[PDB]
């Protein structure tokens, strides 16, 4: 049972101390670690530190965790990994940025989620809140074609019947001769945006001037634009839903423990097939029969499925859905399970865009009761988890037990004569409603 001489390398801004890193059972193999802490990195300090670490001990792995927001550290780490044959994991900060294409001979794996997984989570939110009419605004930032193709294929193979009205690409310089017409074409309520944080400000300012931001319109943006949460520009409306990574509950000690677990488990599983474990180079200067790629597609650790995909991403990441409340801070709403999504707000509240210069009155609260053939109440179909297309959602307060007054707002589906009348009135008078069945009693008596 040979051990692994893993080397853990972190940053000063984290409160982690070297003694805790050197102390931190249950791992299949023994792991003695070498820990050094360093501040902001540079393309020469990285290389000097890494070459020094490989001299004196046969380093067998590496766990690099940073704190800055520079997106060249990932590429430097990939280059070093492909030149020295050292399995490198990304943990936090700069290294966690997802690099799309890596060299075929590099063993660099990262913690994070790609644009496909972020798009899946956004579509899941839209389905769960019954927003089935939407548009799509993308600039010429790299990756927009992948984004659009994935969304189209996902929409074409669903049970819900998405009505994707438009696919807009603002390719000009916001000349207002074409971008203005393009943005006038949009009349839906849900808009997916894909651009860098610098272009997002301009587009949102233009949309606010045009009148596209209010109590009704909902904007959903990926983790690209809602980046560092300390810097919040003035053009972001309050209520901007975005998907990001879990920097709140995932402790750095948990991250480094999981890294050590993955490396030890992969080495242990590879020791059975071949009786030799992979090792680093003799030295950086001077002058790969089997690799670990096939041994990191299936790895299990404490019930948590830590398997990596065939491309270099996590199979089960930990995304988090965040919104920008009225206090100009990003507040966490719901998390991502192994497969499905949990939301804290069963009923989506209404957020005051900007200074809520125009208060809303078109949203009404409507109370009804079941008496066929005027109002009929049915349960929600579990096949699509959505009311069939000829009904409207409702909600009813059913108490779990009579001992306590706590209950749940069960969501059902309604239809009938009065409901057809109501939909016609909504289409004509142009208002929106919040239907719910009455709980206290029958029609009325004093």
């Amino acid at each position, epitope marked *: *049972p*040979p*051990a692994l*001489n893993i080397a853990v390398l972190l940053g000063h801004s984290h409160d982690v101390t*070297e003694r805790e890193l*050197r102390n931190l059972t249950g791992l299949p193999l*023994d792991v*003695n670690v*070498v*820990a*050094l802490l360093m501040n902001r990195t540079d393309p020469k300090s990285l290389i000097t530190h890494v070459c020094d*670490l490989m*001299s*004196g*001990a*046969r380093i067998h792995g590496l766990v690099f965790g940073d704190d800055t927001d520079q997106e060249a550290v990932a590429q430097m780490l990939d280059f070093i990994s492909s030149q020295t044959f050292i399995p490198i994991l990304g943990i936090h900060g700069g290294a966690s940025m997802i690099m799309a294409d890596k060299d075929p001979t590099s063993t660099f794996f990262q913690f994070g989620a790609s644009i496909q997984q972020q798009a899946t989570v956004m579509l899941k939110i839209m389905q769960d809140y019954d927003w089935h009419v939407f548009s799509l605004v993308t600039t010429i930032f790299p990756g927009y074609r992948d984004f659009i193709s994935f969304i189209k294929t996902t929409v074409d193979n669903s049970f819900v019947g998405w009505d994707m009205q438009n696919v807009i690409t603002l390719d000009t310089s916001f000349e207002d001769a074409k971008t203005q017409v393009q943005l006038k074409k949009i009349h839906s309520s849900v808009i997916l945006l894909y651009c860098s944080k610098d272009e997002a400000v301009l587009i949102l300012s233009e949309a606010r001037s045009l009148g596209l931001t209010g109590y009704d319109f909902f904007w959903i943006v990926p983790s690209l634009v809602s980046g560092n949460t300390e810097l919040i520009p003035k053009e972001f409306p309050s209520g901007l839903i975005s998907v990001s990574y879990d920097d709140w509950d995932y402790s750095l000690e948990a991250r480094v423990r999981d890294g050590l677990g993955i490396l030890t488990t992969a080495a242990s599983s590879m*020791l059975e097939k*071949f*009786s*030799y*474990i992979p*090792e680093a180079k*003799a*030295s950086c200067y001077g002058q790969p*029969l*089997h690799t670990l790629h096939q041994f990191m597609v299936n790895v299990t650790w404490d019930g948590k499925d830590l398997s990596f995909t065939e491309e270099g991403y996590q199979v089960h990441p930990r995304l988090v859905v965040i919104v920008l409340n009225k206090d100009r801070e990003w507040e966490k709403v719901g998390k991502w399970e192994n497969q499905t999504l949990s939301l804290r707000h069963a009923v989506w509240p209404r957020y005051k865009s900007f200074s809520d210069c125009e208060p809303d009155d078109n949203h009404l609260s409507i109370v009804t009761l079941e008496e066929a053939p005027f109002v009929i109440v049915e349960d929600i179909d579990p096949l699509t988890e959505t009311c069939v297309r000829n009904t409207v959602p409702c909600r009813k307060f059913v108490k779990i037990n009579n001992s306590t007054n706590e209950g749940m707002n069960v969501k059902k589906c309604c239809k009938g004569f009065c409901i057809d009348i109501l939909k016609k009135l909504s289409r004509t008078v142009k208002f929106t409603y919040d239907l719910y069945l009455v709980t206290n009693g029958k029609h009325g008596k004093k």
Partner: antibody
Amino acid sequence: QVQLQQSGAELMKPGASVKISCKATGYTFRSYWIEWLKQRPGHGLEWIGEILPGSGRTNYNEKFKGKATITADTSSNTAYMQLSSLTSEDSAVYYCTRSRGTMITREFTYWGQGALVTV
Amino acid sequence: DIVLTQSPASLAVSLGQRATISCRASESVEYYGTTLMQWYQQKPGQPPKLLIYAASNVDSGVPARFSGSGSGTDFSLNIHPVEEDDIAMYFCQQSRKVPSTFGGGTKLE
């Protein structure tokens, strides 16, 4: 238990070539490095080279580059040292040592009996 | 590389009190919190035996009379009480820089 065994003493006319065999009989042979050492008559030690039996990777010291060759066979559990162009200064004892994969240093633990060559 | 040097080359000490040996390295051999230095004892006609690793930790299966300490570029080894075991030579090996190197040796009587 880990035990290592070598060949007997060697004595040839100057200019010949000799082989030294080291046999491992206590562990998984395809998992640990095998280092070679040279000992002159009681005035120091040096380092020749190492071989990983599993993958076959080899490292050498600069002074002994191009003079000695290390080859190992995964079937007979043998490590072969290939000396070339012996001279008057090659009369020394040769050891094969193997560490244990449990510490952060690179130390020498299990030692061979050693073979003495004379020219 | 690193070049070691042991002083004195030959030492003669009476049995019972103590014996001290130093091995000063040319460059610092500290590797991120653990100094790399080992001591050997070799009886004539036999392979050497490992005594101290990491310059401060004793090897299992050896009498407690053997000890070592030091830091940076200077290290020392002291034994007490002097007995019939300290008759062979001693060596210091560094492992900071490849290739590994050995000392000059020192006998006792």
